[model samples]
Target: PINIRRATINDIICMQNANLHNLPENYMMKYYMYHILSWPEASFVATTTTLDCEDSDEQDENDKLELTLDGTNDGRTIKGEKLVGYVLVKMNDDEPPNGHITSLSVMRTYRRMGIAENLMRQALFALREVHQAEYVSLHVRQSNRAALHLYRDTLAFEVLSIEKSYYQDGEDAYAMKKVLKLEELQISNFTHRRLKLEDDLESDLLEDIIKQGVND
Candidate 1:
């Protein structure tokens, strides 16, 4: 069995471990902290509900229990679930609002179970709903055909261009982008329109206040 949820501070170490185990582009602990802090709604993680530690004997005060990095007691500790996959995402700081996939990976044993797809879907939807991202973008190494297929074919991302030597190791990269449509993500169209209208009203009021101040 598997479960997915939004990552908290406690999950950062484990998420970093998963990234190190699954991909070569590993990041420091601070970077994970930045992602969680700056864009709390964007990232998500997947974990197994079934654990080997569940059958272990209960710990007593005198017992010396082991703990996972997230400070869970034994294997079935209460800290949180063990992460098997994650997708780190953020809104791009550019003229037109956009989202960027910073990193995505799944543990090797848990592959082909639609975990990656679901993780990406959740992140993409949150990016649009919370951050108002108009589109999403990502870069894949030319050598990674599997990821390329997932981004281009599975996720329907269109390749915008190919950048030469995009990777540190001199590998080229395919820059891909996906224009967002709220209907496809199952967002309530009427609700989003209403929210935007409310936002426009608030902006208009702020502009009026500023203009009056300048005139006075």
Candidate 2:
């Protein structure tokens, strides 16, 4: 299972790799750093150390953690986990009651597992709760129907407009927006169906004139 968590500077190299592998649009390291330095709470990443090691017998396969270590003099080896997906989020204080989804991607092998959606929801919740953003918006390529389905149908974003030739290849993009309501954007919505006190005082339930109520 993948756990969603806040992204940090250490994760940007992996993020950029995932970005290049999964999506066409890519940014520089400083570009990635700027988002984290600016709005640290809004970005998120999905990770898991649960790799399939059944086919190999390497040292890494012998354990549940740590891929490799740097073997330099006075070495400081850093351990790492696998990142499956990420959502880069940002907001401008000058903007009107909103946050932005700068980029979103998931590894191809990890796609269809709802990883992207979880990343998105995490970002949305942070934007609303921490930053007090009233709404959020992102744009997608019109040809990417899967993304459109996720944004418009599953996530309930409305189609704002199709800006003309929004892409470098002269393809239009579907601009999307979703209002951030606390009830809707909150993480937990399940009202557990369990018995309660039933709104009655303990001293209020007695029958004074009961003829057929000996043991009622």
Candidate 3:
């Protein structure tokens, strides 16, 4: 199973590796760290659990060896979940509360799984709710038909302009923008505290009901 979650400080190195593996546009580790530090909620990653399983009597030994060999878990003490996709997003400093997608890519093995779509939705929601962003913008390579379909057909981003020679290799780019209507996005307009309260209330009610049943 794949898990989608907000990108944390520790995920920067892994995210950078994923970017390097998947896209021509790459950034330094500091750039990844900058996005997470400046706008932590605006980015997300899709990852799958890694396991070294064994059923033999020597399973424990095998597990230890596997752990030692797994380069993904490099002394950070963080569990290794192989990153399959990610979206790097940030709120733009200028203008009427806008957000920008700095980069987005999915490993070839994980393409066509809707992982990118989910990553985008999470980032968009975070931008809209957490940062009060009014809209989001991104540049897509004109040659990337799949991504263009994703932005225009799947996500409903409109073409703002065709930027000529926007890429380092002289490729044109399509500047796309999406008006973030929070209501249309179906993101709940509730605070974290409110959600916590709801969870607490539900737990308390369940406990009370169990107690009453026991008493009876």
Q: How many clashes in each structure?
A: 0, 0, 0
lDDT of 3 by residue, 32-102 (tens): 88889999888998886543211112224335657546563567565355577889888886569999988
Which lDDT value does model 1 have at 28?
71
Q: What 10-residue stretch in candidate 1 is worst by lDDT?
A: 50-59
Q: Encode model 2's per-residue lDDT on 94-197: one tens digit a residue.
A: 55678988778787777778888778888888999888898987888989998999889867899999988999999999999999987787655322222122
- Model 1 over residues 1-216: C-alpha lDDT tens digits? 779888777677776553335444454768889888999888998885423312222333343444444355555544335677888887776478998888787877777877887788788788888888899877889999989988898678999999999988999999999988666764233244313533454467977779979995
Provide TM-scores for the models: 0.66, 0.68, 0.68
Displacement of the residue 166 alpha carbon in candidate 2, Å? 4.0
RMSD of each: 13.1, 9.5, 8.4
Which pairs of residues clash in candidate 2, taking residues 3 or more apart in a chain or in different chains? none
Over 4 Å off, model 1: 18-27, 50-79, 164-171, 187-216
TM-score of 1: 0.66
Name the candidate, 1 or 3, with the larger TM-score value.
3
- Candidate 3, residue 94: how far the Cα is off, in Å: 5.9
TM-score of candidate 2 versus the correct structure, residues matched by position: 0.68
Runs of candidate 3 with Cα error greater than 4 angstroms are 18-20, 23-27, 51-79, 164-171, 187-216
